[PDB]
Amino acid sequence: RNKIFPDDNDFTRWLALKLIGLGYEVWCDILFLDKGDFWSNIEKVIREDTCKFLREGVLKELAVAAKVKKQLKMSWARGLKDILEAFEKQKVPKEVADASKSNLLYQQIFLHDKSVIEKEEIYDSNWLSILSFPEELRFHEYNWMLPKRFDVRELTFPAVRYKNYLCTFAWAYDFTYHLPKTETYHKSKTIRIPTEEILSGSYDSNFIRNAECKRLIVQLLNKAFELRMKDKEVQEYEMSNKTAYWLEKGKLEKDKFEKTMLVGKQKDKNWHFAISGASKLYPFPVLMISSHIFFTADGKKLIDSSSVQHSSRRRQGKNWWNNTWRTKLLAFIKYLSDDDTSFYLEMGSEEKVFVSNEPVKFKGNVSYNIPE
Amino acid sequence: MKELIYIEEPKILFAHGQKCTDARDGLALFGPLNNLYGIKSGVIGTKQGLKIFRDYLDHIQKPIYNSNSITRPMFPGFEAVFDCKWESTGITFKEVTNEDIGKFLYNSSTHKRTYDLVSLFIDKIISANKNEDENVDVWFVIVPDEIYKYCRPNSVLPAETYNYDAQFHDQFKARLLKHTIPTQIFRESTLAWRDFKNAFGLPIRDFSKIEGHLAWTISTAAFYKAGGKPWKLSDVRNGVCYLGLVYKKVEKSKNPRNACCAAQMFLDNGDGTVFKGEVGPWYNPKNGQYHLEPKEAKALLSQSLQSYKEQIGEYPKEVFIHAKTRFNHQEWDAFLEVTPKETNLVGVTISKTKPLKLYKTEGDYTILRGNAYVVNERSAFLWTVGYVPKIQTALSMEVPNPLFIEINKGEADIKQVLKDILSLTKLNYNACIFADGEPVTLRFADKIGEILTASTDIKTPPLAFKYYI
RNA sequence: UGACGGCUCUAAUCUAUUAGU
DNA sequence: CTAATAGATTAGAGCCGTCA
Ligand SMILES: [Mg+2]
């Protein structure tokens, strides 16, 4: 008692939910997700407490309805109104109406296998951890011993001007070929400052400001990253505001490094994964590696059409997924590693800056069940 | 090793005082907050625009199906979900003569013909509004595709009307501000998306699987512009007043004239959640700078506080200012000059662009949405875009870039700020969505800015968002 | 301008150094 | 005030995708 008995799935869903919302009890197979007592209950309900009823199976149901009757002796708004009028005219019983039951059924049925799983997960990142720094920051007093238009960025060792000094991580007697008057240099006039205090934030001095010192150090890091990328026989692209360093074609083994494809062919055109180096000291020393895709014609010469570049990049980025991005980033980073766990930036004759080849790992608390 | 935390689901209130997390099904199963009577629509344009609009209004009331229903909910009809009838019977049609259309697409200069088009539409709208016995609910604007397509700013056709903006929609919306008429601008491409094809046999863009969201979005925006509300929030506590701030530039002008506009969440004491733009554009004469002068910023904050107090009855304890740029010392001094006695101010800076890509170890789906990476006490990444367990699909396509929420000034809690920011990603009425990738407090202000930029002589600006969205 | 996201190019603007008086 | 070298911040136009 007190109970009333794949092309229109959502129509039936909405109809049943609305009929429940107005206080009409509806029994359907979409309530009990589990299957396997499935027909005996229906037959028992039909035989015992069924008074009025609203393909081989369809024919059998029609025959059952006919036997029961013999024994008894535009828009959807119009349809809804007709259904309501028919229900009211037939005096079909109803109880107190409430939407709380509908909300609870929706919560416990509609989103059953779509919930939150309390499982910890580990994520990679694009931030390359920085291990160690040289013992000092070197400022060389090159007073009237270099040309004024000498163009400091032409040197083989990273250095940038500052007032009348030169800042680098190399010795005081390097790159003497390009700057011949170097031998008559007194060593007591070179400023050496340790990296630990200036990078951690314990260096307040008039010579250089901490934000300025960070900008100088990231400039040296970017310049040395550029020099290293040039060193490894890797071509370059001059981007809108930065520089990207893309591997050539045939450089790797079968266009593969560590079972990862970084350069390939698309239709009659060649594409090349690239990276861009941008070191920052916030929150902690990292060497960020943003990802890009450039396209060329023969694989060595860049194409001089920005519209073609953007169109090809957007066409290629549709099919890329998290796994591909991770694999390509990690493979490109590992290809520039030196021996086992880190690659140095050649910032000195015998002094190097160690940056690890393993990106920072993030650990979580809540995971997502990813149900196929 | 670094840790990740999770932020609880915000949830949104609906009819009968119920609760849910997804707005679409919250409307479908329960209904909107209020009950409207009907919507009356009026087309300005040719007879073709009339035909297109009538076809669209007939299509909105009918069920809509896709290939797979798992991705998006189906459209059952506007009246059934909002409890108010709106069809092509309460219509007021105003003709637009093709002879007049032809006479303006001849000067080969965008300024003159653009201004002529704006005038030729606005005069018809005002004449219909004034000198007719009918009372249209929302005035609808239909624009021919090709004429505007040739009305691009930096384009040419292959002085009284020359010193004006070179865009149609912005100036047209700026010229109806002093009339306070809810006007909705439709490009003919949107609604007449089925009568335009190419010489290839296949559409360039697959629009056969976004029909449902198109219908939901337009229907929700219209119902909002009719004076109704689709949904609100469940846990808006006292002392909460979200306020937006976005910067825009006027391009073609003698002075740079930096344009800053504001939008404001707050309570209206009607047990609802009313969104009004207490915005009157503030000008920065300096070039390139993105900082309000003390006077203009002080005026903005004072107007927001006065609107709240005259709307509720008391100044809230806490005010949130979501901004796309950082702040200076004198700007924060200006905001602190009008701060009430026993109150505190929080300014959230959301730098959208920052390189940080995360990878799951096994699956190709991206990071879960509501994750939060706490770098420090006054910095965090909040993945406003991400995987949604409710719909099992991805909001974005590629690896999302988490927003860099910095508490630039003031003292607050990172958990509470991140939770409030996540909550504010569902209160848009343009599109009935699950969640937004950017807070609407930083997007509706931008839409206001792009609306009320083409003209600066308007006094008594409109308040509600029916006019601008 | 029915929406959203991811992008390309694009200049402008702030800070520090250098050279045009 | 004016022109070069870096980083760090900002906007603006123009284009691509939504199936599976
Ligand atoms: Mg609008």
* Run of H or E including A40: helix A40-48
Residue B212 to residue B198: CA distance in whole angstroms:
23
Residue B441 to residue B446: CA distance in whole angstroms:
9
Closest approach of chain A CAs to the CA of B98, in angstroms? 34
Report which DSSP code applies to B159.
-
Chain B residues with CB-CB distance to A321 below 8 A: 364
Cα B185 to ligand 1 centre (Å): 7
Contact predicate B44/B124, CB 8 Å: yes
Residue B318 pairs with which residues in a beta bridge?
B344
Residue of A nearest to B7 (CA): A366
**Helix and strand tally (H, E) in chain A?**
9, 14
In terms of residues, how long is chain A?
Answer: 372
DSSP-based three-state secondary structure for B190: helix
The pairing of beta strand B264-266 with beta strand B258-261: unpaired
Tokens 């003031």: give the residue: B410
Closest C-alpha to A286, from A211, A356, A202: A356
In terms of residues, how long is chain B?
Answer: 469
Distances (CA, A) of B266 to B23, B240, B304, B309, B316: 20, 7, 10, 10, 10
DSSP-based three-state secondary structure for A235: strand
Closest C-alpha to B145, from B168, B162, B123, B164: B168
The pairing of beta strand B41-44 with beta strand B19-20: unpaired
Chain A residues with CB-CB distance to B364 below 8 A: 321-324
Closest C-alpha to B72, from A218, A10, A199: A10
Contact assignment for B367 to A123 by CB distance below 8 Å: yes
Residue B245 to residue B290: CA distance in whole angstroms:
11
Q: How many Å from the CA of A216 to C1' of D7?
A: 8
Domain ranges across chain B: 35-228, 242-451
**Helix and strand tally (H, E) in chain B?**
13, 17
Residue A52 to residue A54: CA distance in whole angstroms:
7
Contact assignment for A365 to B6 by CB distance below 8 Å: yes
DSSP-based three-state secondary structure for A263: strand
Q: Which amino acid is at B1?
A: M
Residue B282 pairs with which residues in a beta bridge?
B260
Residue B327 to residue A29: CA distance in whole angstroms:
59
Contact predicate A312/A271, CB 8 Å: yes
Pull the structure tokens for residue B124: 């018809």
Q: Which amino acid is at A151?
A: D
* Run of H or E including B264: strand B264-266
Tokens 């931030």: give the residue: A127
Contact predicate A28/A15, CB 8 Å: no
Q: Least CB-CB distance to B389: which of A11, A116, A122?
A: A116
Pull the structure tokens for residue A363: 């650990």
User: CA B150, B152, B154 angle in degrees (round to 5)?
Assistant: 120
Residue A208 to residue A141: CA distance in whole angstroms:
15
Contact assignment for A103 to B69 by CB distance below 8 Å: no
Q: After which residues is chain B broken (C to N over 2.5 A)?
A: 158
Pull the structure tokens for residue B246: 């976005």
Helices (H), B329-436: 329-337, 414-423
Residue B173 to residue B177: CA distance in whole angstroms:
7
Rg of chain B over Cα atoms, rounded to whole angstroms, equals 23
Chain A residues with CB-CB distance to B399 below 8 A: 322, 325
Contact predicate A299/A263, CB 8 Å: yes
Pull the structure tokens for residue B46: 């040719």
Report which DSSP code applies to B407.
E
Closest C-alpha to B3, from A282, A361, A359, A124: A361
Mutate to test the interface with A, among B1, B9, B85, B357 (most CBs of A within 10 A): B357
Distances (CA, A) of B169 to B122, B246, B251, B263, B347: 12, 19, 16, 20, 32
B15-26 residues labelled b (16+ CB within 10 A) or e (exposed): beebebbbbbbb
Residue B362 to residue A123: CA distance in whole angstroms:
10
Distances (CA, A) of A215 to A156, A220, A333, B4: 21, 9, 24, 30
The strand order across the sheet containing B138-143 reads B41-44, B138-143, B183-187
Closest approach of chain B CAs to the CA of A363, in angstroms? 5
Q: Is A105 on the interface with B (CB under 8 A)?
A: no
3-state secondary structure A158-178: CCEEECCEEEECCCCCCCCCC
* HSE toward the beta carbon, residue B28, CA cutoff 13 A: 23
Tokens 């409207």: give the residue: B36
Q: Is A116 on the interface with B (CB under 8 A)?
A: yes
| Percent helix, percent strand, percent coil in chain B, to nearest 5 | 30, 20, 55
Q: Which amino acid is at A46?
A: I
Q: State in words which class domain B242-451 has.
A: alpha beta
B398 Cβ nearer than 7 Å to chain D strand: no
Angle between helices B23-30 and A9-21 (to 10 degrees): 60
Contact predicate A101/B20, CB 8 Å: no
Whether the bond between A371 and the residue before it is cis, its omega within 30 degrees of 0, is: no
Contact predicate B369/B383, CB 8 Å: yes
* Run of H or E including B415: helix B414-423
The pairing of beta strand B242-248 with beta strand B318-323: parallel
Q: Which amino acid is at A120?
A: E
Strands (E), B35-75: 41-44
Cα B190 to ligand 1 centre (Å): 14
Q: Is B244 exposed, middle or buried (0-12, 13-18, 19+ CB in 10 A)?
A: buried
Angle between helices B47-60 and B211-225 (to 10 degrees): 100
Pull the structure tokens for residue A72: 């008894």
CATH number of A4-108: 3.40.50.10140
Residue A291 to residue A76: CA distance in whole angstroms:
51
Residue A352: left (phi > 0), alpha (psi -120 to 50), or beta? Answer: beta
Residue B47 to residue B79: CA distance in whole angstroms:
26
* Run of H or E including B381: strand B379-382
Residue B134 to residue A258: CA distance in whole angstroms:
74
Tell whether the torsion through CA atoms of B267, B271, B272 and B277 is positive or negative.
Answer: negative
Closest C-alpha to B111, from B62, B48, B157, B59: B157
Q: What is the DSSP string of A54-119?
A: --HHHHHHHHHHHHHHHHH---HHHHHHHHHHHHHHTT-------SHHHHHHIIIIITTTS--B--
Q: Nearest CA to the C1' of C8 belongs to which residue?
A: A310
Strands (E), A117-268: 122-123, 128-132, 137-141, 160-162, 165-168, 191-193, 235-238, 243-246, 263-266
> How many beta carbons lie within 10 A of that of residue B452, not counting itself?
25
Closest approach of chain A CAs to the CA of B324, in angstroms? 20
> How many beta carbons lie within 10 A of that of residue B29, not counting itself?
23
Residue B416 to residue B325: CA distance in whole angstroms:
21
A83-99 residues labelled b (16+ CB within 10 A) or e (exposed): beeebeeeeeeeeeeeb
Cα B183 to ligand 1 centre (Å): 8
Residue A8 to residue A109: CA distance in whole angstroms:
19
Long-range CB contacts for residues B128-135, cutoff 8 Å, separation at least 24: B128/B42, B128/B44, B128/B92, B128/B94, B129/B179, B129/B181, B132/B92, B134/B40, B134/B92, B135/B40
> How many beta carbons lie within 10 A of that of residue B418, not counting itself?
22
Residue A280 to residue A217: CA distance in whole angstroms:
9
Residue A277 pairs with which residues in a beta bridge?
A289
Contact predicate B297/B331, CB 8 Å: yes
Chain B residues with CB-CB distance to A106 below 8 A: 25, 29
* Run of H or E including A363: strand A362-363
Residue B380 to residue A103: CA distance in whole angstroms:
35
Contact predicate A152/A159, CB 8 Å: yes
Contact predicate A288/A126, CB 8 Å: yes
Residue B72 to residue B24: CA distance in whole angstroms:
9
Q: Is A129 on the interface with B (CB under 8 A)?
A: no
Contact predicate A345/A224, CB 8 Å: yes
Q: Is A117 exposed, middle or buried (0-12, 13-18, 19+ CB in 10 A)?
A: exposed
Contact predicate A346/A224, CB 8 Å: yes
Q: Which amino acid is at A213?
A: C
Residue B5 to residue B361: CA distance in whole angstroms:
18
Closest C-alpha to B316, from B295, B341, B347: B341
Residue A7 to residue B76: CA distance in whole angstroms:
15
- Start-to-end CA span in chain A (Å): 42
Contact predicate B40/B264, CB 8 Å: no
Q: Is B466 exposed, middle or buried (0-12, 13-18, 19+ CB in 10 A)?
A: buried
Tell whether the torsion through CA atoms of B329, B335, B337 and B339 is positive or negative.
Answer: negative
